[PDB]
């Protein structure tokens, strides 16, 4: 007899997710131990999960694809393959998908999107001489980001600006830039009321969030599977943006954010 251990990676989004899992199981009288903010993320969570010292966490499909399964991000992330390999090689179950994808995208103002009819990356590339683009230094470094985006879409931005990751949204507000990279769950999408564009050629890989849990734990706690499945498809990108906004902008604790979310779902 030992409480089920919910692990998370160090990010604020991950603390919210860990509290959603923990509070939901606690509501059903299943004892929980929180192991939040594990340095190194998956590479240190995964060995503990296989050894039974963690029981569950929220993983992103593309992260499992590249880090645990050693597959290339230039090949489309395949959920069915992930689920099968996780069961067979690791005795781990993906419960399902929460409903959101946390990956790179590109954003502009809603006014500029309406002015130029911009909905997709290809639209932004078509109109890119009217845009000054900004991103963090790392985004300009390898083929997985800006360099590859240029090979896929033929952008001709009027200017390019690299800066500290924490200055992008501020630089957009000042008009130093008028297009930038975002992550699709960023609180700042809601805060700044940004238009997030569609990656029509599928350049950026998929990082769909889902609960990974030991099959041994589901065998011993069959009700845990039924309970956790109630979260399937309940958190789309806009919902995750809002929960992140509550923590990062409204300064609400991840635990309270998670509690209020579960209550809104009737769980």
Residue 210 per-residue DSSP state = E
Q: Report the relative pairing of strands 4-7 and 209-214 from DSSP bridges.
A: unpaired
- Residues 6 or more apart whose Cβ sits within 8 Å of residue 8: 14, 15, 17, 18, 35, 36, 37, 38, 57, 58
3-class DSSP state for residue 32?
A: strand
Nearest to 194 by CA among 89, 137, 124: 124
> In the structure encoding, which two tokens stand for residue 120, read together?
């997709």
In the chain, where the domains are located: 1-102+207-267, 103-206
The span from the CA of 147 to the CA of 136, in Å, is: 13
Q: Are 233 and 99 in contact (CB under 8 A)?
A: yes
Number of other CB atoms surrounding residue 31 within 10 Å? 10
Displacement of CA 224 from its chain's centroid (Å): 23
Q: What angle do CA 68, 187, 239 make, to 5 degrees?
A: 75
The span from the CA of 108 to the CA of 203, in Å, is: 18
DSSP per-residue letters across 166-197: GGHHHHHHTTS-SEEEEETT-HHHHHTTEEEP
**How far is CA 199 from each of CA 75, 118, 119, 162, rounded to the nearest angstrom?**
16, 12, 9, 22
Q: Are 167 and 175 in contact (CB under 8 A)?
A: no
Method used experimentally? X-ray
3-class DSSP state for residue 40?
A: coil
> In the structure encoding, which two tokens stand for residue 166, read together?
């924490």
Displacement of CA 62 from its chain's centroid (Å): 10
């Amino acid at each position: 007899e030992k409480p089920l251990v919910v692990a998370t990676k160090p990010s604020s989004e991950q603390y919210i997710l860990g509290e959603i899992l923990s509070l939901l199981l606690e509501k059903h009288h299943i004892p929980i131990k929180r192991a939040f903010g594990i340095g190194g993320g998956t590479m240190n969570i995964h060995p503990a999960l296989i050894r039974g010292d963690f029981d569950l966490y929220v993983e992103y499909t593309g992260t499992a694809w590249v880090n645990t399964l050693k597959n290339p991000l230039t090949q489309k992330v395949d959920f069915e393959t992930i689920k099968k390999r996780y069961e067979k090689e690791f005795n781990l179950l993906w419960v399902g998908l929460l409903g959101f994808n946390n990956t790179y995208s590109l954003a502009i103002s809603k006014e500029d999107a309406q002015k130029y009819a911009i909905e997709t990356f290809s639209d932004l590339a078509f109109h890119s001489p009217n845009f000054d683009f900004g991103a963090e230094f790392d985004f300009f470094e390898r083929e997985d980001a800006f360099k590859g985006l240029m090979k896929a879409y033929r952008f001709h931005f009027r200017s390019l600006h690299e800066m500290d990751i924490n200055l992008r949204y501020k630089s957009f507000e000042s008009h130093k830039i008028n297009a930038l990279d975002v992550f699709t769950t960023d609180a700042q999408i809601k805060e700044l009321d940004l238009k997030v564009l569609k990656d029509d050629k599928g350049f950026f890989p998929n990082y769909q969030a889902g609960i990974v849990i030991r099959k041994e734990t589901i065998k011993k706690y069959p009700e845990a599977l039924k309970i956790l499945e109630k979260l399937d498809s309940k958190i789309n990108d806009e919902t995750m943006q809002d929960l992140n906004y509550q923590v990062e902008v409204l300064k609400k604790s991840p635990k309270i954010v998670a509690k209020d979310f579960l209550e809104r779902l009737g769980l």
